[PDB]
Amino acid sequence: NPDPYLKKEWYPVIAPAHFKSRHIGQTPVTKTAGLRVATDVINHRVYEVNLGDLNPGAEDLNGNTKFYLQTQLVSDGKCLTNFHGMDITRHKYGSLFRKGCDCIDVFMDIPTTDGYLLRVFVIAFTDRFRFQRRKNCHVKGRVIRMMRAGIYETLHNELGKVSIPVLVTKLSNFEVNAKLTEALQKITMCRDVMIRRVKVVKRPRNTMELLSTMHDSN
Amino acid sequence: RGRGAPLARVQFPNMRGEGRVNELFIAPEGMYTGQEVFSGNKATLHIGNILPVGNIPEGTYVCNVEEKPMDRGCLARASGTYCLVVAHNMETNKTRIRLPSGQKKLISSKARAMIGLVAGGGRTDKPLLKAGNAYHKYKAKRNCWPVVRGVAMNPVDHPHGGGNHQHIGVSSCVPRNAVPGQKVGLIAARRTGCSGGKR
Amino acid sequence: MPVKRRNNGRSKYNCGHTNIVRCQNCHRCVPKDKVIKRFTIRNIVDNTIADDVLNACVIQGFAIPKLYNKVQYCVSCSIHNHIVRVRSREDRKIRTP
Amino acid sequence: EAFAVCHIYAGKNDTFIHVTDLSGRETIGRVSGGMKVKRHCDEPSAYAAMQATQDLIEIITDRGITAVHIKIRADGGTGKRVYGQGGSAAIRALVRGGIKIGRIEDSTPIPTDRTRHKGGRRGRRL
Amino acid sequence: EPINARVIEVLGRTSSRGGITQVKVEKRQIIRNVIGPVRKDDILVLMESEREARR
Amino acid sequence: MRAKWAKKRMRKLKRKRRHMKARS
RNA sequence: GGGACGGGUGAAACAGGAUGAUCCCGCCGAGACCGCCGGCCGCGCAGGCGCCUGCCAAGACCGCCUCUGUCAAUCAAGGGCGAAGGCCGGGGGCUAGAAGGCGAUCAGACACCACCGUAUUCCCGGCCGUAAACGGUGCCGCCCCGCGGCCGGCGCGCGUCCCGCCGGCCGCCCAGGGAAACCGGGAGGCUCCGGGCUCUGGGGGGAGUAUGGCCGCAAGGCUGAAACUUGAAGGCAUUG
Ligand SMILES: [K+]
Ligand SMILES: [K+]
Ligand SMILES: [K+]
Ligand SMILES: [K+]
Ligand SMILES: [K+]
Ligand SMILES: [K+]
Ligand SMILES: [K+]
Ligand SMILES: [K+]
Ligand SMILES: [K+]
Ligand SMILES: [K+]
Ligand SMILES: [K+]
Ligand SMILES: [K+]
Ligand SMILES: [K+]
Ligand SMILES: [K+]
Ligand SMILES: [K+]
Ligand SMILES: [K+]
Ligand SMILES: [K+]
Ligand SMILES: [K+]
Ligand SMILES: [K+]
Ligand SMILES: [K+]
Ligand SMILES: [K+]
Ligand SMILES: [K+]
Ligand SMILES: [K+]
Ligand SMILES: [K+]
Ligand SMILES: [K+]
Ligand SMILES: [K+]
Ligand SMILES: [K+]
Ligand SMILES: [K+]
Ligand SMILES: [K+]
Ligand SMILES: [K+]
Ligand SMILES: [K+]
Ligand SMILES: [K+]
Ligand SMILES: [K+]
Ligand SMILES: [K+]
Ligand SMILES: [K+]
Ligand SMILES: [K+]
Ligand SMILES: [K+]
Ligand SMILES: [K+]
Ligand SMILES: [K+]
Ligand SMILES: [K+]
Ligand SMILES: [K+]
Ligand SMILES: [K+]
Ligand SMILES: [K+]
Ligand SMILES: [K+]
Ligand SMILES: [K+]
Ligand SMILES: [K+]
Ligand SMILES: [K+]
Ligand SMILES: [K+]
Ligand SMILES: [K+]
Ligand SMILES: [K+]
Ligand SMILES: [K+]
Ligand SMILES: [K+]
Ligand SMILES: [K+]
Ligand SMILES: [K+]
Ligand SMILES: [K+]
Ligand SMILES: [K+]
Ligand SMILES: [K+]
Ligand SMILES: [K+]
Ligand SMILES: [K+]
Ligand SMILES: [K+]
Ligand SMILES: [K+]
Ligand SMILES: [K+]
Ligand SMILES: [K+]
Ligand SMILES: [K+]
Ligand SMILES: [K+]
Ligand SMILES: [K+]
Ligand SMILES: [K+]
Ligand SMILES: [K+]
Ligand SMILES: [K+]
Ligand SMILES: [K+]
Ligand SMILES: [K+]
Ligand SMILES: [K+]
Ligand SMILES: [K+]
Ligand SMILES: [K+]
Ligand SMILES: [K+]
Ligand SMILES: [K+]
Ligand SMILES: [K+]
Ligand SMILES: [K+]
Ligand SMILES: [K+]
Ligand SMILES: [K+]
Ligand SMILES: [K+]
Ligand SMILES: [K+]
Ligand SMILES: [K+]
Ligand SMILES: [Mg+2]
Ligand SMILES: [Mg+2]
Ligand SMILES: [Mg+2]
Ligand SMILES: [Mg+2]
Ligand SMILES: [Mg+2]
Ligand SMILES: [Mg+2]
Ligand SMILES: [Mg+2]
Ligand SMILES: [Mg+2]
Ligand SMILES: [Mg+2]
Ligand SMILES: [Mg+2]
Ligand SMILES: [Mg+2]
Ligand SMILES: [Mg+2]
Question: Which residues form each disulfide bond in the chain (chain C) (predicted)?
Answer without folding.
Answer: 23-26, 23-77, 26-74, 26-77, 74-77
